[PDB]
From TrEMBL, chain A:
InterPro entries: AF1862-like_dom_sf, CRISPR-assoc_prot_Cmr5. The keyword Repeat does not apply. GO terms for biological process: defense response to virus. Keywords: Antiviral defense, Cytoplasm. This is CRISPR type III-B/RAMP module-associated protein Cmr5. The keyword Heme does not apply.
TrEMBL record, chains B, G, H:
It comes from Saccharolobus islandicus (strain REY15A). InterPro entries: Cmr7A, CRISPR_Cmr7_comp. Transmembrane segments: none annotated. It comes from the Archaea. This is CRISPR-associated protein Cmrx. Gene3D superfamilies: 2.60.120.1670. The lineage of its organism: Archaea, Thermoproteota, Thermoprotei, Sulfolobales, Sulfolobaceae. It holds the Pfam family Cmr7A.
Automatic annotation (TrEMBL), chains C, E, F:
It comes from the Archaea. Residues 11-277 form the CRISPR type III-associated protein domain. It comes from Saccharolobus islandicus (strain REY15A) (Sulfolobus islandicus). Pfam families: RAMPs. InterPro entries: CRISPR-assoc_RAMP_Cmr4, RAMP_III_fam. This is CRISPR-associated RAMP protein, Cmr4 family. Keywords: Antiviral defense. One of its GO terms (biological process) is defense response to virus.
Length: 154, 173, 285, 153, 285, 285, 173, 173
């Protein structure tokens, strides 16, 4: 079933891997790939999603650099090493809900701009919480493996 | 359908039964068995007028008339007084809630007109004076069910809930 | 006809099962289960008969000749046998389920595919002509399910959506509205498409690694690691026991088969991997 | 389960809109982080008295809260300190209403006129160990929506 | 009489235990705990046997031949072993409790589910039939709890309300207030409904992150962080030891099993994660 | 015996202690303390072993091979270590007291609960079987205390009442006659029910917010404000150091474990956290 | 000791109702528990005679006779053509076992001396006989269990399975 | 020391007492308290001869006899057909243990000669035998533990565990 999720995990990672100029931000992402995947399946998806966005520190040019990453390949994530890493993982999760048609791409892209709609995004993900958590597993587990392999210490 | 009416717990005597025979059916709103009185109705914005225990509408949210709304129709007489109100029972403020009501409840309340004779300055009337504390049970509680004053050692608690639950306001003018 | 009667039964795994097959398949398993023509676990008729015949000779040592007449007479005497087992066919494998409130909540469910239910129907049609104790109360149920082939189905439960084995989201449809369930356990039975079911079923199969430890240094030996495959508890295999017309089989089917409730099949009994339960579909129907 | 994460979404949505000024938003973001750890360290009742005092609930602010229970265009009046503490007080009462810990009718007639506020705080004190057990995940969700949807100062 | 002796025993954890991953399904935890078929924690009998075997080959060096008989030779086996271990079903896990109100307040409780008690009854029924034993005392107890299925119940205590593992609110019926506890403990036992029990149980499991520090910088090594899964203290498993007639099975059941109280199961023994206590059902009644 | 030497000890926090459990979604403190399976603080034996092993490797630079055998190699571990640590159970925590109903004034007091003692009985009962070493002087103090369960008792005091940690009222009943000060100090020890003890112990932990200031403009950084959780100085944890016989376990027990007085646990070492004192039970009487 | 006996179910006269008695109390073996017939007993090595229906002791294990167990005593009109025997519960050949049994059973079986005048020859007999299934449910399934011809019964199950399960070997002489 | 006698409980006629002594002091090992029997002794390597019920020493470890340890001297009349042993507590093979023992005992068991007359052969035979349990309930336990029929209404329990705990091996000759 999820044979094309190891593919998706490779394009999503190669995007995050490049919009992480600072080396300490890659290492910080490798820390998110290991940890965040293991709270989604012990604490739940949206309890971990809330934790992700709260540490992501949205509402900046960052929140619009994400929108560019969906299509562009020259976008960059700037901010705290702990912020770019947590926000880069928010991309990873959202990049999947787009490419798999769980969340409409047009909704998500305009919900990432209109402040009034972000609450409706979190409200949509709450009802898609059981469905999402099942599908992303193979995808996130692959992202975890790619991180430990590709993100190396100098 | 389920006809119900309001009778509350003041110091006055006009509240003795104030309304003729109960529904005849086995349904009521208020339990009396284990923890004393249950599901005491509280209506806000009304006072008792120290006599003729009817509820003149005030405006402030501080005025209480705590009583036991029960099943029945008012006095089988002139309907010049009572509210004749219907509500889905999710819209009457009960206290000490117990086994849940689920249907619409047509209720009758001892309503008086605003009586625009002069100012209405309410006077909080707490319940005391043990002699009437039993008289209240003797004139109200023992008849509404009759499972009390006959087979209850729980009469002791009904002596206490009146001096603990019901506390209201009155114009006294 | 010389197949006077046929006695189908369900093989219910009380513990995990391991009926071995050498190293016949690839995946990564060194000691895999016995497969069939399309990859599901089966119990071969040789292993199922030999296990029941090795059992039941210790259980009823006085009736050794009644069993020899029916089940083979393993000695050098070679009179023909009177009883035949068919390969045990995977009927339903347990699956962890997360349903979206969707129900009175369940934690696990039985999962079948339409491929597996065709072979059960094939076995059921084939003996209806001699079983004058016609179990059409069961054969019809498979017929209605097979009529609804081409979509995920829930027989008696009303879920409409669930997550099977933490990985597969499926939407379910009632049979038509309702029908009695086969397994009397208070557990729903899902019948999935053959593509989705083959993934959900392969996820219920237990594939463990096992270790041999150097007892003096408490570390694993060199090459002391291997892999095995077990069939979970509560799994259900369906098979038939065909009997030729004789007087020994009348005793065997009446005296011996009534008292078989638990037997031991397969290997690795030291790990407790063989306790299974037979249910004799003539009373559960 | 995650019913309390959905409940924290409805509540934060009401607060996020009733807080007009953006500096009043950045103050509620401060309350959401501090007041969740203070219920951990200090306990519910000490923190509730602290909240309910900086709220400065006269009757004007009580109606804004009582209406906000029902309407979705009520607005909190006051300065960043008062509105944020009054918002967080509503955040708490919203949970005790939508969880049957207090009868909503009681809580609304208690907030209204003169003195049943003392009855409420008296009642809230008797339910203190129950509340401080149930609101942990809820206030922690509010703390994370705040840090996510409201920028810092 | 298929089994000479049949010894059901509980497995009380004295320290947090950790039996290694085993399986092949990829999972989020780096070194997970052994899973059941329902997803609950369990101990494969292959791990019970290997650990108990090596323990007995140390504590009873003179009877080293009675152990090789009942538990199989090690290096060059001429013959199959005589004793079997059944996989250790999770019987009860501890869960911290915020008791709303009652006369006696509680800080923690044993939590079990109806699905787990059904697996135990499956073990007890089959072992009862495959042996002379008859654990009617347990079976009469568990068959009364399984009658109240689909409803959270507290076994003896009076709770009526509680918040388990800080996140789940439950209301509890009382069963009889006369039936004695399953095990010897003043701590009550809650038999949760299987759906809410699965989430309450996943909270009792102990996920742990561990690191390997560079000795010369006192920082984590390059990728020297990993996660790990333990089963709490006071967790009760349930397994059975079985044996066939050999004149060493009688000695095993007489000395070896009657002097076994503490064993070290699982791995991570250097950090104390294996000490466990065995309570034989012959005694806990 | 299974273990050559069994050396229980107490861990006395000289300064505030912080063994980290890492940040987590459901915590609400950014850097929390390692917790038990029932809420109380604890020191995972992996933290104990790694901290003590790293200490010994530099304090006894010639006993490398003796430490590596008992605590495991680091470069190429061709075998298992011979010594085990057990998770440090919280024995007693310093609590602030209001000495009402008495005129002999204490400022603080040691507070423990019954569930914390039961876990110490378990540690003592187990290792008294896996080794010849018995701890009757300690096992009989603890069991004398456990007899008075269901009541708050004070051992070496005459208090009759107190207000622990500013909030919690306790009616203490002095012990029957006396107990010779399990943890020798002029300060008394209270044993509380666990309903109260859970709150008292949690109020006794130290939670501190810290900041990071920009290096040029003297202002806090963006989001550089986090909270931490320490265990108060003068807290006591109970643990055991077990070992199997190797001719190095003898040296370890006889040379190293008698020169182990002060080690450094946990993190936050530059804040002076983690200095701690090991007090062996063998010489604590 | 408790008294029960075994009324078989052929398509045959002389077994309209033989037991002459009913429970006396409310303890049985066989049932109709809303899912068919439970705990049907079978006796092998015994064949039935159309003439004066009863079981004749063949020596062939292939021959058998299926019926039900009713609590009572024989006809008490001949009282000798009945083999009475005390046997435990596990000893009985039972079909579709639903519950446990008392481990103490005294069973009376319609019996006769083999009457060796003619040789014996049994033949498989099914009792489908769509018109005959009606008469015996009239004769026993209601004369033993009145509630069948009352509030609850599944006609599409029970008015089918008497034809479907009960079978035997008859002498056909 | 402490003279504790061992009386096995098989289904036997001479099994009643064969003893003229009881507690004498204020001690016991086997007890019955609202949960069943406790500290039942099991002697392995011996079998019972039901004729004059007595332990006969075989060498088979599979042969065992479960019995109770009653307090009392070996009846002080025969004193020759009884094997006498001074044993520590850790040497006892106890079942269903409650609390440890005085650590030094004096066991008196009914012992017989190996009787080289006939070859040995043992049959595992339990004590279910409801016709015989109500006898020993009266005979062995009640005579020793009158406590059953005095204040310990749990009579079915001690009746429940006899049929489950004691399962001896006999010669059956």
């Amino acid at each position: 079933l999820y044979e094309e999720d190891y593919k998706l995990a490779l394009e999503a990672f190669k995007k995050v891997f490049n919009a992480l100029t600072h080396y300490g931000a890659k290492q910080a992402f490798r820390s998110r790939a290991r940890d965040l995947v293991e709270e989604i399946y012990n604490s739940g998806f949206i309890p971990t999603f809330f934790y992700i966005i709260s540490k992501a520190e949205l509402n900046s040019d960052s929140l619009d650099s994400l929108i560019s990453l969906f299509s562009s390949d020259n976008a960059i994530l700037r901010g705290s090493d702990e912020n770019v890493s947590y926000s880069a993982y928010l991309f990873i999760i959202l990049y999947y809900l787009i490419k798999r048609g769980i969340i409409e791409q047009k909704f998500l892209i305009q919900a990432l701009r209109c402040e009034k709609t972000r609450l409706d995004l979190i409200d949509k993900l709450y009802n898609l919480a059981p469905i999402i958590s099942a599908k992303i597993r193979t995808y996130l587990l692959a992202i975890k493996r790619l991180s430990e392999a590709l993100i190396e210490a100098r | 359908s389920t006809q119900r009416e309001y009778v509350f717990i003041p110091i006055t005597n006009s509240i003795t039964i104030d309304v003729k025979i109960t529904i005849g059916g086995s349904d009521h709103i208020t339990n009396i068995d284990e923890r004393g009185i249950h599901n005491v109705l509280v209506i806000t914005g009304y006072a008792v007028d120290e006599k003729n225990g009817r509820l003149v509408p005030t405006l402030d949210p501080c005025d209480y008339v705590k009583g036991i709304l029960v099943a029945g129709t008012p006095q089988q007489a002139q309907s010049n007084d009572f509210l004749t109100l219907k509500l889905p029972a999710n819209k009457l403020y009960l206290i000490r809630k117990k086994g849940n009501i689920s249907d619409d409840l047509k209720i009758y309340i001892p309503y008086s007109s605003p009586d625009a004779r002069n100012s209405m300055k309410t006077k909080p009337v707490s319940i005391s004076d043990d002699t009437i504390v039993n008289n209240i049970i003797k004139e109200v509680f023992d008849k509404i069910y009759n499972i009390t004053q006959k087979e209850k050692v729980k009469i002791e608690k009904v002596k206490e809930d009146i001096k603990e639950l019901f506390s209201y306001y009155a114009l006294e003018q | 006809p010389y197949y006077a009667f046929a006695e189908p039964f369900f093989i219910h795994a009380i513990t995990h099962l391991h009926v071995g097959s050498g190293s016949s398949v690839e995946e990564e398993i060194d000691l895999p289960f016995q497969r069939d023509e399309l990859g599901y676990p089966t119990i071969y008729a040789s292993s199922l008969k030999g296990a029941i015949k090795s059992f039941l000779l210790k259980e009823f040592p006085d009736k050794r000749d009644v069993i020899y007449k029916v089940l083979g007479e393993d000695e050098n005497p070679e009179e023909a046998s009177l009883g035949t087992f068919l390969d045990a066919i995977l009927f339903a494998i347990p699956s962890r389920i997360i349903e979206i409130d969707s129900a009175k909540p369940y934690v696990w469910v039985y999962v079948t595919t339409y491929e597996l239910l065709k072979k059960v129907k094939l076995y059921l049609d084939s003996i209806s002509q001699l079983s004058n104790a016609s179990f059409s109360n069961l054969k019809n149920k498979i017929d209605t399910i097979l009529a609804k082939e081409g979509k995920n189905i829930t027989l008696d439960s009303d879920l409409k959506s669930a997550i099977l084995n933490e990985d597969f989201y499926v939407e379910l449809e009632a049979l038509n509205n309702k029908i009695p369930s086969i397994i009397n356990a208070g557990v729903p039975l899902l019948v999935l498409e053959d593509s989705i079911g083959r993934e959900v079923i392969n996820r219920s199969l237990i594939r463990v690694r096992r270790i041999r430890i150097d007892r003096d240094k408490k570390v694993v030996e060199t090459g002391g690691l291997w892999s095995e495959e077990y069939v979970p508890m509560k799994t259900i295999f369906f098979s038939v026991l065909l009997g030729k017309e004789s007087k020994e089989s009348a005793i065997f089917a009446s005296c011996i088969l009534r008292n078989l409730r638990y037997v031991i099949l397969g290997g690795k009994e030291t790990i407790g991997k063989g306790i299974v339960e037979l249910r004799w579909v003539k009373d559960v129907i």
